[PDB]
């Protein structure tokens, strides 16, 4: 019936937990730009949200409310993932602060949209440069340039926001302004060329493509600069020992939450199963205990990170 959507929500959550668990395998790079204290608050907030989801997961499987069960599962998955990222980020910060450790860095990931927009804009500009292009051809090139430069600027905005490195964060936005400014100028020359196709307006419209192509090339080159590539930190043995409380607790919470969701998936189908209700309460107990142990350890290392 309406169980199918609940079953699939459980499958998605379990897959997502498996993905965030790799963050705990061997932290050697920062996840994001959060401070140690931001990580602390994030773990706090996400655990509140998780605690209410675990009650919603349990009550709605028992009472047969399949849409409310599915939404509890989706909520728990998002909170568990948020939690794990803040714990992996905190773990990294603990490990590299040991004086025998060496820093790592997140590589910037290049949007696949970049390549698409790049090729599209180049072909559209090459078209605008053909000495015999028509008013229909000029309209289609303008349509393609506008669509892909708008998408390029938004990819830059998002890439800027998820880059911790401040030089890369700044360049993504400067590139976005270069693209937007040169696109605005180009379409203005297209507007003039439209209906006045002299060699002089062709030359000007042709000249206006050069700044846009330079902006696009500069952006795609910077995205490949070696100084922004991922480098794994060298965590000292004393660094590793210090991140153990956070890492172990995060893993245990993930293991138990996975077992909780796997059990709730079956209880949503047939909730007349006392053995599985007691398994589920065991897992939920360990989820809570592990969160308590992780938060406690983070609060206590906290003076060293002020």
């Amino acid at each position: 019936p309406f169980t199918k959507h609940g079953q699939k929500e459980c499958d998605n959550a379990l897959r997502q937990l498996e993905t965030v668990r790799e963050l705990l395998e061997n932290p050697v790079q920062p996840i994001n730009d959060m401070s140690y204290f931001g990580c602390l608050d994030s773990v706090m907030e996400n655990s509140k949200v998780l605690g209410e989801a675990m009650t919603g997961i349990s009550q709605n499987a028992k009472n047969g409310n399949l849409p409310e069960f599915g939404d509890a599962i989706a909520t728990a998955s998002k909170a568990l993932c948020g939690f794990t990222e803040a714990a992996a980020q905190a773990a990294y910060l603990v490990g590299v602060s040991d004086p025998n450790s060496q820093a790592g860095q997140q590589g910037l990931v290049e949007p696949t949209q970049f390549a698409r927009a790049n090729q599209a804009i180049q072909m559209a500009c090459q078209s605008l440069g053909e000495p015999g292009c028509t008013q229909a051809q000029v309209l289609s090139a303008a349509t393609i340039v506008a669509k892909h430069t708008s998408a390029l600027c938004n990819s830059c905005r998002l890439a800027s926001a998820r880059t911790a490195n401040p030089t890369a964060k700044r360049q993504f936005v400067q590139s976005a302004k270069e693209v937007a400014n040169s696109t605005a100028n180009l379409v203005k020359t297209i507007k003039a060329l439209d209906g006045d196709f002299t060699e002089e307006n062709r030359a000007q419209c042709r000249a206006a493509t050069a700044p846009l192509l330079e902006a696009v090339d500069n952006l795609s080159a910077f995205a490949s600069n070696p100084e922004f590539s991922s480098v794994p930190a060298q965590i000292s043995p004393e660094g590793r020992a210090a991140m153990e409380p956070i890492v172990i607790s995060a893993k245990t919470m993930l293991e138990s939450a996975g077992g909780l969701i796997q059990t709730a998936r079956a209880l949503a189908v047939n909730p007349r199963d006392p053995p599985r209700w007691s398994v589920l309460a065991g897992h939920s107990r360990t989820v809570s205990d592990s969160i308590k142990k992780l938060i406690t350890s983070m609060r206590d290392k906290a003076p060293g990170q002020l």
């Binding site: 349509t143 600027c153 936005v173 976005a176 696109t183 379409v187 439209d194």
Partner: peptide, 23 residues
């Protein structure tokens, strides 16, 4: 679309993008 609308769009995008923080 039409050329007039494309011009409005990229000009409005330029106004928005030029205010973006680099920090």
């Amino acid at each position: 679309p039409e050329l007039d609308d494309i011009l409005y769009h990229v000009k409005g995008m330029q106004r928005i993008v030029n205010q973006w923080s680099e920090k």
